[PDB]
């Protein structure tokens, strides 16, 4: 009851994987509910999040044209559908999920197992969807 | 949506409520509401009156009662952020943040202090980000 989104992101995502970034944002407007970052070239922006939210909801295939832009970095898409987008930049992995109302995204540090990242993000997405979030 | 699930699954799990409502403070637009055997539906008009009163002249609640769902609560505490009332064995707690109005009332005999804690903690969550 009444816990902060920042605590939730830090706990549910960032304590479970070695992240370069982690963000929970609103699916309508790309408004950041909470985010954590390590040393990104640029801060994650509302614009970046709105573009992702709009794309995953309207045309996930669109990520094949130009990639996935977050934190001033470009990830090349490896999977795209309405609920799940995955990409890679070098040995860093990105996983993005859409629930009813939010977008969840996290990218790992170079070399961290992508499968762990994906499982954590996707499990948390599922939990949230089951609670109507 | 998410607000209705929050009310049902969180607030109403931790408080035995006769009613709960989350509303916009500026227009009294309902984000989510729950009702258990109220005489009438909670209306935007009821919410707008409360929003206006808690913001402008909270002493107005002593004058005009607190009207929700066709029920009348009698005010026991009033300031700009927090209004409390009673009707029989039922307690009402109302909180205003910058942009939201929160209200819940208990079923007969449920601890008012739990009511107040839950409502007030949700107000705090919102005020933490200036909502």
């Amino acid at each position: 009851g009444s816990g902060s989104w920042q605590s939730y992101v830090d706990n549910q995502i960032c304590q479970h994987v070695d992240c370069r970034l982690a963000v929970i944002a609103g699916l309508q407007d790309g408004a950041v509910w909470a985010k954590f970052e390590k040393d990104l070239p640029k801060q994650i922006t509302q614009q970046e999040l709105k573009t992702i939210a709009d794309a995953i909801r309207s045309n996930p295939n669109s990520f094949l044209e130009g990639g996935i832009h977050l934190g001033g970095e470009k990830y090349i898409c490896i999977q795209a559908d309405n609920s799940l987008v995955r990409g890679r930049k070098g040995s860093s992995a990105l996983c993005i999920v859409a629930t009813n109302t939010c977008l969840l995204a996290a990218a790992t540090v170079d070399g961290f197992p992508p499968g762990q990242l994906n499982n954590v993000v996707e499990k948390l997405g599922d939990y949230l969807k089951a609670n109507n979030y | 949506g998410s607000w209705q699930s929050y009310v049902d699954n969180q607030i109403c799990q931790h408080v035995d409520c006769r009613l709960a409502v989350i509303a916009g403070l500026q227009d009294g637009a309902v984000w989510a509401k729950f009702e258990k055997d109220l005489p009438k539906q909670i209306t935007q008009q009821e919410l707008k009156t409360i929003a206006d009163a808690i913001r402008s002249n909270p002493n107005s609640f002593l004058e005009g009662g607190i009207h929700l769902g066709g029920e009348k609560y009698i005010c026991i505490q009033a300031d700009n952020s927090l209004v409390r009332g009673r009707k029989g064995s039922s307690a009402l707690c109302i909180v205003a943040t910058n942009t939201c109005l929160l209200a819940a009332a208990t079923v007969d005999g449920f601890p008012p202090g739990q009511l107040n804690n839950v409502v007030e903690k949700l107000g705090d969550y919102l005020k933490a980000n200036n909502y």
Binding site: S2, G3, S4, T101, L128 | -
Partner: peptide, 6 residues
């Protein structure tokens, strides 16, 4: 504004 985490 979003509700708290479930």
């Amino acid at each position: 504004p979003p509700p708290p985490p479930p």
